Write a protein that binds this ligand. Structure first.
Ligand code: AMP
Ligand code: AMP
Ligand code: AMP
Ligand code: AMP
Ligand code: F6P
Ligand code: F6P
Ligand code: F6P
Ligand code: F6P
Ligand code: MG
Ligand code: MG
Ligand code: MG
Ligand code: MG
Ligand code: MG
Ligand code: MG
Ligand code: MG
Ligand code: MG
Lengths: 327, 327, 327, 327
């Protein structure tokens, strides 16, 4: 039995006796992701470059892959009839869905993350988090400001050498590979569990001069291990989604901590940090700011930022211990 | 005018008054690259996971992405009738083409570079160097031992967010985007020049403990600039084809020096270093071991290794200066 | 609001408060159809012709597009956990599903119809019919032998200039276009209604010498109309699915009546005639053997054949009237 | 050896010692065909139905499949720099290429044949004839008025269940299947010969009332063979590129004679009849008006019509004989 993402979401909804709304939603996401992968890989680009002249587009009509992705997600999630509030990294205010189209879910998402790696063709992705609306209040931003522990679903798609969608829900993490020949995501790894202890460390060392003493001490120990074993390898793609996926698949540790330009960290809590922290915990890994769990921070601003350390349990705890030692 | 790789190649052929044999060769190579790009993106993988039944291939005896890539390249290039000797990373010996398919070209390639990245779905690519056979004797492995200065053409395909072929010949370097909807490479950057100076440095800092003092000093300048300017950012994908392509397009530096641990460096002279050094020089960059131009080494083994430092000419010149000052 | 086939089947199941099983089934069909379209269009055929040598397949391994289609349908329908009996034109006996995989539906299908048009690249398709199992008896052939009026769902996919899936259920017929870029069927025509009266007649006139007097009289009147208007155009692709689709879209009449080689007709009742007759009636058109409604014949053999006339109401009734006049 | 159209074309170029200009032209034409094949198969149609929003194109002002095809062909062929005069069905006048893009070839094409089939999704195709400019004067429409005997190359792409390019030149006819997974045409039938005699006849019998007595007599022989052999089967897709390709591959006959109604026939001499007659003769078939070889007519208008009867040489010879016996 081959298992497609479609069959799997549907069968899980049936196990949960859902009314179908969340199913509809996940199907939406899965379509929007295909639509993104295909534009990311440059299909149809010969039209941009005048294979057929220029008469297709009018006055001015084009999209940057970032704007296009954003429109795809918004419109496809709205068509699911499943959502009430969306938060996009691209919109300064939460988007409230029109009542005729309104369902009970809240979706925070990064439509295309890794934008410093776009023009150089390095791996980029899409990051998403889903909440049930709590309240019966007229929908509003407040419904987005839930801590990560309350996610129903979260994950990301990675547009790498191939396209992969990873999905975490209450019972674990499953990976599905996009077969672009038929437009199906094919379950390829079931119940994914992160190695306890990796041998790769992943951070931008360009900020070495602005790290705190604990990051600095940890990095040193990665290079010059007190016990004299082989040093961790370094890997920093520069796209959170790729660096985080490698982390999950290979083991190891990923860091984006505080720096002067970003004293509170760079990465966004809602659509970058929380989803990736939920995937990580369901896969038996950890996700800390250095001081507390990411999934426990109650956010107060939809574009709030937080420091993030995540990955294999022994590597992250090893880092927390340095923090606990310096404090 | 839209310009496809096939048209460009063919015009370049007529300007130079070639017999057609080398053009034949470049069309072949472009065909191999589209075929690998498709396998890499995972089309028809649904067949591998039992969608049409016959589900005993689960303990995989079937060929890996790298064995496929190799077979395509070797096969598509014999069928060009333009080559006599091939060297592939995956073959311990030079391949001597059958007399009835013999042509006058020698080809060095790394059918799929970035194998540690294969699993985690991070960018990977293909790299090639083309030479002419000078010798009038039987073709043999010595035919592939010609310094990089002698290259007639070299380049690489990156399988990243999208697939790009970058091709450098005597008159400079061009970038062609693969539009997978019609299987054409489209010209998108003509006559590419890297910038004098970057703000990115790329090296596996995991080996800090094995770094020679010049590397160590340079790295320190990048993080703690003595003149208090902005620190360079750090990126290491860990696929040479990706780090290199970023270096080309954004500027900056890429390093794989000898550590104490492995004294000649890790990267291979004939089908990793040479083609990349040639692309970089043709683009205005430099490519040095620290002590000499990469392209001037006389290779003595077709799997020989070399340290390589390549990229923006100011950033490489500055490192060169540290090496000297370390007398 | 763009509507994909996925969203639509799911939303219809939710309107009907289904438990999801039929939904699962239709999703299965929709995946299997994509898998078929892609093989039909020859993706990957370069491997057949040794783009990479021959080392992929072992001993002997290949499929004819007919056998491949059949395996796709069987395995994909079985994985839906929704079916109990399948009937394929390819299998002499009804297939009973294993109990661990057993749902309540019966599916009769032609995995790839139009086989005389395969080697010449003319349009071919897939035809399907679905029944609820009536009985509580241990599943058996008997569950397939239901008249057409008891179909829950039926339709076909056409592999033509583009790929289209047409689906009829209790409330009408909807057409969905396969966008091969993203693997989504996109609803493109809602509530399709056949023109009352066409201007095209479609039959193999090669059997003119073996038609009955009514077919002969009707054909004549198509060419030499008593009222002196413009004669009907002729069109006979030789694939039931294409000829039937044109009929639906353009109006007109399609005929495969009795001939000496086939006194009871050629086309199969279960997987060729019944599904196409259900689509036709839901679209406001007719479907008769000449003597009775197709959907009313209670079949007694899963491979039973029946004569078929179908299409626009005034054209078919006009033909029935000739039959009623000769009897 | 696998043989792609690009490689074949290029070898044919070197055997004949061409300057490269015509090869350039054929590569262009193959590129146009892949681009049309993609539009025809409906990739990115999800964009047209509002998947990324911006859903005011619903009253379609945007260009039809046939206007797109035309633009591609005209544009890809000017960019070859190999042509001076083009004639397209869709242009009432010959196009004279700009001096700076001028080459020596004249091209007659029907960018998308089978327009009555466009909607119903039945096969459609593209047809082309290439000539040399003899004249030394300014290029003009008269340059395209050279009889089919003068063709340097002609052929057609069928967009059917799959897409095929069939190319005929002085030494015969070859069939290339498009593998859309890598955008290569692969050689699959080399040096194609039609069979002496078929068992299929293809004509729009809707015009029976306007048929000349020879056609009428021949049709009668096909249904009621005087010698009591098996009656021919009948097929009429109604796309010339499809009926013709079936005729080529299975044998038999294809007819579009003059009816009383339209005395010169319907099909166009320069870009429908000529290229097909040339493919048929090069394959061992015949192509006659009933009174003369198609390829020998001196055209006098670039949109002139001709009756055409083509296919197996015994089946056409037999009709020719009826025409004579009708003195
Ligand atoms: N496809 C699904 N996968 C996993 N859990 C689901 C699914 N559908 C429903 N559920 C669970 O059931 C709850 C109610 O579902 P719904 O009725 O669709 O809003 C959800 O919030 C989930 O916890
Ligand atoms: N397509 C081409 N692009 C660039 N240079 C070419 C091309 N074809 C030939 N040349 C130059 O002409 C030389 C001889 O061509 P050939 O006879 O095809 O080997 C080559 O070694 C190149 O230096
Ligand atoms: N997706 C659907 N579309 C149309 N009708 C449906 C759907 N799902 C269920 N139904 C109707 O509800 C019945 C019971 O559905 P099920 O519980 O899935 O077997 C079916 O036999 C259909 O008549
Ligand atoms: N690729 C080719 N295939 C077949 N014949 C060709 C080719 N190239 C050139 N020829 C023959 O050589 C003539 C002159 O070639 P060109 O100089 O490219 O126009 C053409 O008119 C053809 O007859
Ligand atoms: O260049 P920096 O500061 O290391 O940040 C790169 C990071 O920023 C982001 O692009 C912000 O989304 C992440 O994808 C990535 O990890
Ligand atoms: O893990 P390391 O030692 O940094 O190796 C990474 C390098 O190895 C290679 O995979 C070998 O080709 C290169 O692509 C890449 O630069
Ligand atoms: O060649 P004939 O006898 O006209 O029959 C062709 C018919 O047979 C079938 O191939 C049988 O499925 C149909 O697809 C098609 O209508
Ligand atoms: O409906 P008719 O008159 O038979 O015309 C069909 C013919 O017309 C055309 O569409 C005109 O190109 C041909 O493709 C086809 O043979
Ligand atoms: Mg973003
Ligand atoms: Mg982001
Ligand atoms: Mg390799
Ligand atoms: Mg390598
Ligand atoms: Mg069949
Ligand atoms: Mg059939
Ligand atoms: Mg036309
Ligand atoms: Mg036409």
């Amino acid at each position: 039995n081959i298992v497609t993402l479609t069959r799997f979401v549907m069968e899980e909804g049936r196990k949960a006796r859902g009314t179908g709304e969340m199913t509809q939603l996940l199907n939406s996401l899965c379509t929007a992701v295909k639509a993104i992968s295909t534009a990311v890989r440059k299909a149809g680009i010969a039209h941009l470059y005048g294979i057929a002249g220029s008469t297709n587009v009018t006055g001015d009509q084009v999209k940057k892959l970032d704007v296009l992705s954003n429109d795809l997600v918004i419109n496809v999630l709205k068509s699911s009839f499943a959502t009430c509030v969306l938060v996009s990294e691209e919109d300064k205010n939460a988007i409230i869905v029109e009542p005729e189209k309104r369902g009970k879910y809240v979706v925070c998402f990064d439509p295309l993350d890794g934008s410093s790696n776009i023009d150089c063709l390095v791996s980029i992705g899409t990051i998403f988090g889903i909440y049930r609306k709590n309240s019966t209040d007229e929908p509003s931003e407040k419904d987005a400001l839930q801590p990560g522990r309350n996610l129903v679903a979260a994950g990301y798609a990675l547009y790498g050498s191939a396209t992969m969608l990873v999905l975490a829900m209450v019972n674990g993490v499953n990976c599905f590979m996009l077969d672009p020949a038929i437009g199906q995501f094919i379950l390829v790894d079931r119940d994914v569990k992160i190695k306890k202890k990796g041998s790769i460390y992943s951070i931008n060392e360009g900020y070495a001069k602005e790290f705190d003493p604990a990051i600095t001490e940890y990095i040193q120990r990665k290079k010059f291990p007190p016990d004299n074993s082989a040093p961790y390898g370094a890997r920093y793609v520069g796209s959170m989604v790729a660096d985080v996926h490698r982390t999950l698949v290979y083991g190891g540790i990923f860091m984006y901590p505080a720096n002067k330009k970003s004293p509170k960290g760079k990465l966004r809590l809602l659509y970058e940090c929380n989803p990736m922290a939920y995937v990580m915990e369901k896969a038996g890994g950890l996700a800390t700011t250095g001081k507390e769990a990411v999934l426990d921070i109650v956010p107060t601003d939809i574009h709030q930022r937080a420091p993030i350390i995540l990955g294999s349990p022994e590597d992250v705890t090893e880092l927390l211990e340095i923090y606990q030692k310096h404090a």
